[PDB]
Amino acid sequence: DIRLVKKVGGTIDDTEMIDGVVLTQTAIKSAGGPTRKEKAKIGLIQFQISPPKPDTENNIIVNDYRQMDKILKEERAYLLNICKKIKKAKCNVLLIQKSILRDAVNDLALHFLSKLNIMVVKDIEREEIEFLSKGLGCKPIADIELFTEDRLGSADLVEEIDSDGSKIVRVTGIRNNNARPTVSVVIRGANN
Amino acid sequence: GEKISGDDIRNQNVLATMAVANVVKSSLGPVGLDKMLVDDIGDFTVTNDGATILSLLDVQHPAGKILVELAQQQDREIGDGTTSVVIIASELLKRANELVKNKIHPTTIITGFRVALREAIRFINEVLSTSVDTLGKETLINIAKTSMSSKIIGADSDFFSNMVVDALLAVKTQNSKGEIKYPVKAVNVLKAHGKSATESLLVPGYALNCTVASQAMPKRIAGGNVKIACLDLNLQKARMAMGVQIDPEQLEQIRKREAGIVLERVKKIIDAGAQVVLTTKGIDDLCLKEFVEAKIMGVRRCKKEDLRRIARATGATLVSSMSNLEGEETFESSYLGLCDEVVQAKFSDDECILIKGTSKHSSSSIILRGANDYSLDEMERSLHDSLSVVKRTLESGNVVPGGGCVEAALNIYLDNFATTVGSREQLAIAEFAAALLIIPKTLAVNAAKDSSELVAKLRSYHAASQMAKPERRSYRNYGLDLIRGKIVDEIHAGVLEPTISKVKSLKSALEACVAILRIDTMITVDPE
Amino acid sequence: RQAQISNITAAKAVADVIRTCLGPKAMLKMLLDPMGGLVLTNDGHAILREIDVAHPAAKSMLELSRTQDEEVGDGTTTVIILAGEILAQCAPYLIEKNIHPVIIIQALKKALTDALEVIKQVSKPVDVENDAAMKKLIQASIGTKYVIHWSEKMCELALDAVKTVRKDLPNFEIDIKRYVRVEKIPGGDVLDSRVLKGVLLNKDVVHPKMSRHIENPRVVLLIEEEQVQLMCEQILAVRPTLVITEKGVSDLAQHYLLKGGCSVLRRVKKSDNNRIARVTGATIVNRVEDLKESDVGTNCGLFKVEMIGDEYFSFLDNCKEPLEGSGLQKACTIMLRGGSKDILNEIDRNLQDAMAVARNVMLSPSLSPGGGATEMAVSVKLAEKAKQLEGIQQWPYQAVADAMECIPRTLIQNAGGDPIRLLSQLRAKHAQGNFTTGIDGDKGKIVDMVSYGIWEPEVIKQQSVKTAIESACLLLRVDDIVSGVRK
């Protein structure tokens, strides 16, 4: 229940234990539109956002040149409809698991969330999700069908601390208090 | 594996670190010179900066990697004057071997150095310089002449002193919850061949080096409220499906329909009103002809890292793909920013767009012209390092006199401090005080002068300052002149170094020598 | 002295390699490349780039000659030695005085300022538009090559080029010489060389029935039987007389395009398509369906046939531009039919350098004595200020006077004269009569450069010496070298 955060830079005098959820990994940072998140819901996404790619053989018969861009429009609409229900639930913080496995994510998901001002983070270990779910108390979302506002958590403010070039996400406050909280501390040192 | 115990490990570690340290000691001070490294791979870089050299140099004994990481930490703290920093901790290992042969415990050697540096903080505060202190006309010019030292650019100090100071005045921004500081590393430095340093240009803002793809496109844009749009969308013939694949006229219509939409995507940029548009990947003459009729200045073959600082400084939203909440592809007018003045100037047989007056994030770029690449290799890293000293100067007004004034002064404070502690740690203070004096002694070695003649006279002047508390001045004096070999106040010579640079230099040098003293043995496992 | 010997001996052997590259008596040296072939030439710009040396410190100076050619564009005839000549007299310094090179930096700066004043003392203005002095001035730089036979004809091509494809924007002659194309045809004589307004191509025609000639050209720069036929109909919609594509030409497209009466070419590089698009006015077409009426040819007078005994080449006759100014981009070429590949490669290096030298002539209309008279003229005052100096810096300062005397000495050893009595007479004559006295290019006499007809611009003397002095400080600022770094 006590996680040690390893960050390069600073001194041990700067080491402080955070009272809330902390994220070691950063966002994609390509768009980087929103500079802060406050009074927004923090969700846990156990799935990944990608165009459908089943493990079996997939043959899409295209009989018209307009169907090509139509498939692109379907991929844009199908992936945005998931974000539409997230925007309807007023959740600006999304946590995605490890993205290097299978589905990963496309390049169009950035412009969809940046327009809706929703922060997203990926490459999170499966064991880290269990640790974050205890302290935050947010019910993980394994699909858009089970996605709702009751499973989503909340926080007062989320500040991203940038020190010596290393950025770290810090969450202040906990909405639903459970019986299994978790704490973490950020270790600051010169070298590993 | 191979494991050796006893003094054999500590002896081979000190001799290995001292051998590679004596190579970089020739660059100490204004009289230092650059050196060349042979990488055997065909690449070579001639510079005096220890951060790159220690990273390139192959470390034989694993204990040598500790000093390599020490230079990497200086970059995150200060990053400038590495010739006068990393060589300080190298002298502590030479005198440590005589203490290991004694009965003094290694931790007692460590504890003696811990109380020495902890008390040395107050010693620096006695000779500490305030924000005003000396004349300090702009207070930057006096420091700018100091940054010219340690490097071979000192002959150009009649120019670079005005170059770095006048450029960084517009970098001031409000960030970190109302904190006034300069966003270091946001300054872009450009290089140009020919003439000399007097041809450099100061840009109070961002300057990108690039030209127009087609010569028929207008190269001049004047006036205010100039909007810029960074488009990273690749315009090319689209590839096929997942491998399911698919009348050649309807097959060719795929390219006809795609390129038709590409022309419509550019028409959406026309309705935006941006004067300058950017494109990452290259295009053919079909999409280039549309940019000519668009009356907008385009650029191709753009680097992604260059456009990331454009959206930050200007404030416009970088668009990698054209999309909105609906299924329509267009460009909204809310993704464009504003700037006070934007104009493209011709410099050194080339042209660059000068973006000035950025409201979102203020910064500055320095466009410098010089002899050639090999001559600007030293001038590149040196100017990038000098940006941190000017930052630390106006962030904290505490500075200290350079040229061996600190090392010669700390010896006197430690002479009375050695008798204060006494017991077994008195010998450790004497060896620590004599080790700090080695750096100014090696300063005259590169100048082919007599250091002991100057140190004996210089320390006598610092002694007369400390021995008399009430002091007009019949005694107090400081400073060391390398050219004339005389003692003169640095207020006239204009050599002053920030205090935060010297404090963090000795703070990091403490744990550097301790890491070697804590190694009892070294074992190496053979690789698979 | 451990690492200093490796830096001195790195550029020491370089001086002997390029020693034969200076003067009208310049000779050649055979070099065996690692590729397995051979390179025999008197031009060091190609040698210094392709040479492989053990010491990487000398490789840093190999790029100094390329930098001088990009920034200035001259010096391959003479100054190419001056880049490595400064380090020759710097050897009796570290092994003798044992002083840090920093003193030399202050000595070279004082010698550089005095050298610029001597050049300005002998500087004289000359008309750049007048072909009187410009005819012998162009032949002065190129007179060191095999072109001496045709130098009368070779000067006509270079003199008419700087007054035609240069123009101006107002700032000087500034323009780009890379877009100007020079066609090199081996065999025959240069008597057929003319100034042509259009592009020539070495690729043959894909179809035997197509007849080669044109009056008013139309240039187009680019199941399966009917599909390509419909594609040819889209190409022939504007009725083009010429079709050029970068890829191959199938046999089916030969018969379909034959009905339109056009010529088809293949294997045309993108470098030629960029020049044809500017000369013929057509726009390079990527998608075939994009061909429109805007691609019609412009200002092409006539089309002819130039064929070697082996295969067929594309030849476009001369034309003009109706006026009834915009010198930033010009479209024109110079056709050159060379006798042999040895002299043909030298003319291309001469013509590009002659336009580069004549560029600097019109950038700085001032003119200075050439042929080796200026180097000896500076050494008179450079050694005079050394005796007036009378200080510690005199030793590195006076040693520079030897470097100025060794520049004409290289021409003496190449010509075969006696440098002893010749250089002793020059130093005595320059300090008394005038600085115009110099060494004859052939007999090696005391005849002045005024009556002999060889001159060099002031910008050529100032920029080349200033760059060589600043570039010589490179190895002087290197105190150590480390081998076996293994990045």
Curated annotation (Swiss-Prot), chain A:
Disulfide bonds: none annotated. It comes from the Eukaryota. It is found in: Cytoplasm. Signal peptide: none annotated. Belongs to the TCP-1 chaperonin family. Molecular chaperone; assists the folding of proteins upon ATP hydrolysis. Known to play a role, in vitro, in the folding of actin and tubulin. In yeast may play a role in mitotic spindle formation. Heterooligomeric complex of about 850 to 900 kDa that forms two stacked rings, 12 to 16 nm in diameter. Present with 5530 molecules/cell in log phase SD medium. This is T-complex protein 1 subunit delta. It comes from Saccharomyces cerevisiae (strain ATCC 204508 / S288c). The gene is CCT4. The chain holds residues 193 to 384 of 528 of the full protein.
Curated annotation (Swiss-Prot), chain B:
It is found in: Cytoplasm. Keywords: Acetylation, ATP-binding, Chaperone, Cytoplasm, Nucleotide-binding. One of its GO terms (biological process) is protein folding. The keyword Transmembrane does not apply. The keyword Nucleotide-binding applies. One of its GO terms (cellular component) is plasma membrane. One of its GO terms (molecular function) is ATP binding. InterPro entries: Chap_CCT_alpha, Chaperone_TCP-1, Chaperonin_TCP-1_CS, Cpn60/GroEL/TCP-1, GroEL-like_apical_dom_sf, GROEL-like_equatorial_sf, TCP-1-like_intermed_sf, TCP-1_chaperonin. Its main location: cytoplasm. Belongs to the TCP-1 chaperonin family. Heterooligomeric complex of about 850 to 900 kDa that forms two stacked rings, 12 to 16 nm in diameter. PANTHER family: CHAPERONIN. Molecular chaperone; assists the folding of proteins upon ATP hydrolysis. Known to play a role, in vitro, in the folding of actin and tubulin. In yeast may play a role in mitotic spindle formation. This is T-complex protein 1 subunit alpha. It comes from Saccharomyces cerevisiae (strain ATCC 204508 / S288c) (Baker's yeast).
Swiss-Prot record, chain C:
Keywords: Acetylation, ATP-binding, Chaperone, Cytoplasm, Disulfide bond, Nucleotide-binding, Phosphoprotein. Belongs to the TCP-1 chaperonin family. Its main location: cytoplasm. Heterooligomeric complex of about 850 to 900 kDa that forms two stacked rings, 12 to 16 nm in diameter. One of its GO terms (molecular function) is ATP-dependent protein folding chaperone. Coiled coil: none annotated. Molecular chaperone; assists the folding of proteins upon ATP hydrolysis. Known to play a role, in vitro, in the folding of actin and tubulin. In yeast may play a role in mitotic spindle formation. It comes from Saccharomyces cerevisiae (strain ATCC 204508 / S288c). This is T-complex protein 1 subunit gamma. Signal peptide: none annotated. SUPFAM superfamilies: GroEL apical domain-like, GroEL equatorial domain-like, GroEL-intermediate domain like. It is found in: Cytoplasm.
